[PDB]
Design a protein around this nucleic acid. Structure first.
Ligand SMILES: [Mg+2]
Ligand SMILES: [Mg+2]
Ligand SMILES: [Mg+2]
Ligand SMILES: [Mg+2]
Ligand SMILES: [Mg+2]
Ligand SMILES: [Mg+2]
Ligand SMILES: [Mg+2]
Ligand SMILES: [Mg+2]
Ligand SMILES: [Mg+2]
Ligand SMILES: [Mg+2]
Ligand SMILES: [Mg+2]
Ligand SMILES: [Mg+2]
Ligand SMILES: [Mg+2]
Ligand SMILES: [Mg+2]
Ligand SMILES: [Mg+2]
Ligand SMILES: [Mg+2]
Ligand SMILES: [Mg+2]
Ligand SMILES: [Mg+2]
Ligand SMILES: [Mg+2]
Ligand SMILES: [Mg+2]
Ligand SMILES: [Mg+2]
Ligand SMILES: [Mg+2]
Ligand SMILES: [Mg+2]
Ligand SMILES: [Mg+2]
Ligand SMILES: [Mg+2]
Ligand SMILES: [Mg+2]
Ligand SMILES: [Mg+2]
Ligand SMILES: [Mg+2]
Ligand SMILES: [Mg+2]
Ligand SMILES: [Mg+2]
Ligand SMILES: [Mg+2]
Ligand SMILES: [Mg+2]
Ligand SMILES: [Mg+2]
Ligand SMILES: [Mg+2]
Ligand SMILES: [Mg+2]
Ligand SMILES: [Mg+2]
Ligand SMILES: [Mg+2]
Lengths: 98, 68, 223, 42, 99
RNA sequence: GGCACCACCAGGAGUGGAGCCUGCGGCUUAAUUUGACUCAACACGGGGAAACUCACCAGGUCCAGACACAAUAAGGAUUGACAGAUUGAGAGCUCUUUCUUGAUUUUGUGGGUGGUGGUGCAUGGCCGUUCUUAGUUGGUGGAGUGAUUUGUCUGCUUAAUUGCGAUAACGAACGAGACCUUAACCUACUAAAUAGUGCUGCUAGCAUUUGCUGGUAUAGUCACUUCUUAGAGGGACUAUCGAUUUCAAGUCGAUGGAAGUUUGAGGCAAUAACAGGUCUGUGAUGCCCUUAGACGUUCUGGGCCGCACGCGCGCUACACUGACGGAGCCAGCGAGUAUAAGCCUUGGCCGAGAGGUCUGGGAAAUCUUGUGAAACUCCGUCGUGCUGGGGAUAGAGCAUUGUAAUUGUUGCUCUUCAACGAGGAAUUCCUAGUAAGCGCAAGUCAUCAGCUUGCGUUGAUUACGUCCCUGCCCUUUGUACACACCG
């Protein structure tokens, strides 16, 4: 897929920092509401990450539920060049409730 | 047709073998009596059972009936 | 936006149908049983019932945290507006949803049907169910497909009580040779029902004779 | 189990899985913000 | 104030428990009340074909969705009425309060 | 032997005959996509297709071919592109043309992925059918060496293997019945300014007798729950009395009753089963096929409507128990929106109409709406005539929806006014608010309902019986069948 380098980035600082992403299955939608790029880019960008075991993909009712594996956080540590500067948001260990 | 079933025929004649002195020849009285005698889940079945017990009671006074 | 009473309650139901199916595909491996949508002020409590509450609230409750965020982002919910809780199934043997996935997880492990099938027949009865019947349909190392019923105990089939004392679960089993369809029909004991009727409609419980006392001719006991 | 075995075995073997699992599970019952770093770019 | 509370749900027992409990709470509290007023229940009917394909006798399902709506008028200040709503929260029945 | 208006009897309405609507076959076609072939294919796939849908046809784009490699590659792997040509196209699709972007990416290998592509004769699920007929099963006991059998039956009765009864059986379970939903009753409870009423304020018209019809009334800060709504209950159990019967199960009459055909109607519905239908509902599926000149996807245009013909579900009619023309004027089931992508739409004003326009109400027991519907009723014209029945076919014109109406989407106006004069052999549905008419709403829906799903208005004739036809169920019987006669 031909994604601009900058738009591929924005997809990565949303799939990191809230490491789960939801995208409706419509390829021609101009903007996925929460990542300022084409909606089709979000589906195909994370399809590559799920192809190399960096995101789980779930499909239900024409919607994609992408979640970032713990194995994928280390890779974005090295590509976004981030340091181990805290947890995305879903790993901040807010702990469950009883 | 108006043929009563087995859940009402055997249930009606068990009432007679155990509670005959308290029973009667009145359907209205029997219907009220059976609400404290049997635990019947539905009102229509209570009336159905009491309606057949009264018929059997009305028949016993004319002689002994078979199965009770 | 502005939505009618008729169109809102149907939408609330549709929200329930889509959310529940999301958990069935995602939490299939954790014996997902059902979901309860408890509306409340300033929060939307949702109780998910699963056989295994370790697969959900695992590794510092990460999955449940990473799972509640996927629902706020798809339904445009405020991050504080929803709270998700994970609850253990009380009677694992009486929940057909857990039993069908577990059976699926055994069939998918290559286990023979009888050791697997009798594993749900006896597990249902062991939990105290009045009856249980399992139908397994599909193809197994043979081109022609077959179905087998495994009954046990007492089962009712017709009328409303089937809507009260029977829960059902259908699961498609993806095998290398085709699809296996399993139906796990479990009839709970109506005596254990705690809100609706506690017995079948034709169950008549006649009381016992309280008589055979001795009556003495005619005194009166004063005080 | 269309063989004379595995419904004989399948039956006795099915029961040891559940009977062992009610008790095992009955044992289970007895114990009844990252963009902050990018704001440091200020 | 004159405050109206509108009650809608699919199942009537829990709606009616909340309806009776609020009037009860509007009884020990000396609050004049009007209700509950039973709106004509709405039968949401959907009639589909049974067959996923188009073969067989043409047999139809007829699904239903009962919607019951009750409005109760209470004449009390808004602070008093609102705390009754959280005391009588029930999952099935939703509550909207309009002045 | 028995049951059944998907059987008949007594009958009603019809269909088959006509025109037209629609589906199927055939023929034609560039394609006229396809599934289905007795009941249980043929107004069925919710299939009322202008584009989309769409799978067919003539052409044109795109990769939305992830990922591990290898090659190429900054001295640039590659992407977009004005203008002209080209093209159906203001598709940089491609060609002249040098600009731009920058390792996302181009080529080969593997590997994918997507398919309304094939296979329902590989499958899940669902659905139809046998069949909603009345059937199915074990415990103990009896018979048999056994598989098995009895229980599960001569008779009567019922809608029913449902009951009486007879009984080597006794006592039970599923199915049936119970159950649930709906319709009919409640001046007996609970209330209602989103329901209705009487009084009362204020107010109109007509005769003056103080009366009769209205309007107004969300402050008259009223009263009430009969009508209306809906929750808690009650009520029918064939109640009582006569007949018949093994005096049993029951059946038939009356009386009372709101209801006495299981009170009417439905929902659910056993044990197995069919090579029944669906991979064209599914990001349900195995395998096979294709995968860059795609069978993926998208754009433009056409087709699914194509017409010597056969058949099926239907709509109009053949007139006077009627057509028109005025007038009267009554339901019930339901649905309804926001920065949309536009809902139901009153009221006013234009317009012969169809329709247009300006305002307002309603996310609704509040407004559309009393949906003032149509048959129907009254008064007239018509006068047995292919006539004022019937309204095809077609010409010319006016609007609406839609990017787009040509092969007329639909509506309206004038004109044209065809077969049809009650339909052969055959054949369908039906027993009471039922049949038949008569419309209305919801679904499809930007637009189009001769279709379905329901609803109410008017409202019958004739049985309430039978095994004569047709289909199914049971018993006995024969069997060389058990993949079970498609043997
Ligand atoms: Mg039953
Ligand atoms: Mg039933
Ligand atoms: Mg289900
Ligand atoms: Mg018979
Ligand atoms: Mg007979
Ligand atoms: Mg006979
Ligand atoms: Mg038939
Ligand atoms: Mg016939
Ligand atoms: Mg006849
Ligand atoms: Mg006709
Ligand atoms: Mg053809
Ligand atoms: Mg054709
Ligand atoms: Mg096209
Ligand atoms: Mg295609
Ligand atoms: Mg088949
Ligand atoms: Mg029948
Ligand atoms: Mg024996
Ligand atoms: Mg037998
Ligand atoms: Mg018998
Ligand atoms: Mg009343
Ligand atoms: Mg069924
Ligand atoms: Mg067939
Ligand atoms: Mg399918
Ligand atoms: Mg067609
Ligand atoms: Mg038809
Ligand atoms: Mg007229
Ligand atoms: Mg009305
Ligand atoms: Mg003429
Ligand atoms: Mg005419
Ligand atoms: Mg129109
Ligand atoms: Mg319509
Ligand atoms: Mg149609
Ligand atoms: Mg008859
Ligand atoms: Mg008869
Ligand atoms: Mg015959
Ligand atoms: Mg012979
Ligand atoms: Mg043989």
């Amino acid at each position: 897929m031909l994604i601009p380098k900058e738009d591929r980035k924005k997809i990565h600082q949303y799939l990191f920092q809230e490491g789960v992403v939801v995208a409706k299955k419509d390829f021609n939608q101009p903007k996925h509401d929460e990542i300022d790029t084409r909606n089709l880019f979000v589906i195909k960008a994370l399809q590559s990450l799920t192809s190399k075991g960096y995101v789980k993909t779930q499909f239900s009712w024409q919607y994609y539920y992408y979640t970032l594996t713990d194995e994928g956080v280390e890779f974005l540590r090295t590509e976004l060049n981030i340091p181990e500067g805290i947890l995305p948001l879903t790993r901040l260990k807010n702990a469950p409730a009883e | 047709g108006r043929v009563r079933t087995k859940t009402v025929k055997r249930a009606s004649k068990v009432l007679i073998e155990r509670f005959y002195p308290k029973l009667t020849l009145d359907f209205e009285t029997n219907k009220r009596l059976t609400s404290e005698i049997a635990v019947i889940q539905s009102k229509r079945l209570r009336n159905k059972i009491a309606g057949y017990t009264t018929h059997l009671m009305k028949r016993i006074q004319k002689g002994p009936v078979r199965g009770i | 936006a502005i939505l009618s009473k008729k169109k809102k309650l149907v939408a609330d139901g549709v929200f329930y149908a889509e959310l529940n199916e999301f958990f069935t595909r995602e939490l299939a491996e954790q014996g997902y049983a059902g979901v309860e949508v408890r509306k409340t002020p300033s929060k939307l409590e949702v109780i998910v019932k699963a056989s295994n509450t370790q697969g959900v609230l695992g590794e510092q409750g990460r999955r449940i945290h990473e799972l509640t965020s996927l629902i706020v982002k798809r339904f445009k919910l405020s991050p504080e507006g929803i709270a998700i809780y994970a609850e253990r199934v009380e009677e694992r043997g009486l929940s057909a949803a857990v039993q069908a996935e577990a059976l699926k997880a055994k069939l998918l492990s290559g286990l023979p049907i009888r050791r697997a099938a009798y594993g749900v027949l006896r597990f249902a009865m062991g939990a105290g169910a009045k009856g249980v019947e399992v139908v397994i349909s599909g193809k197994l190392r043979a081109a022609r497909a077959k179905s087998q019923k495994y009954a046990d105990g007492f089962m009712i089939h017709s009328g409303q009580p089937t809507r009260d004392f029977i829960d059902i679960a259908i699961r498609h089993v993806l095998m290398r040779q085709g699809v296996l369809g399993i139906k796990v029909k479990i009839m709970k004991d109506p005596a254990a029902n705690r809100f609706g009727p506690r017995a079948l409609p034709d169950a008549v419980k006649i009381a016992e004779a309280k008589d055979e006392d001795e009556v003495i001719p005619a005194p009166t006991v004063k005080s | 189990g269309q063989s004379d075995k595995r419904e004989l075995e399948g039956e006795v073997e099915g029961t040891e899985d559940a009977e062992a699992e009610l008790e095992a599970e009955a044992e289970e019952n007895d114990e009844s913000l990252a963009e902050l770093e990018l704001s440091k770019q200020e | 104030h004159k405050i109206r509370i509108t009650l809608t749900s699919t199942k009537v027992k829990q709606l009616e428990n909340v309806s009776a409990n609020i009037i009860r709470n509007a009884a020990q509290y000396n609050i004049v009340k009007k209700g509950p007023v039973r709106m004509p229940t709405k039968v949401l009917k959907i009639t589909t074909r049974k067959t996923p394909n188009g073969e067989g006798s043409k047999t139809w399902d007829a699904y239903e969705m009962r919607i019951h709506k009750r409005v109760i008028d209470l004449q009390a200040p808004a602070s008093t009425v609102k705390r009754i709503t959280q005391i009588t929260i029930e999952p099935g029945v939703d509550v909207e309060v309009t002045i």
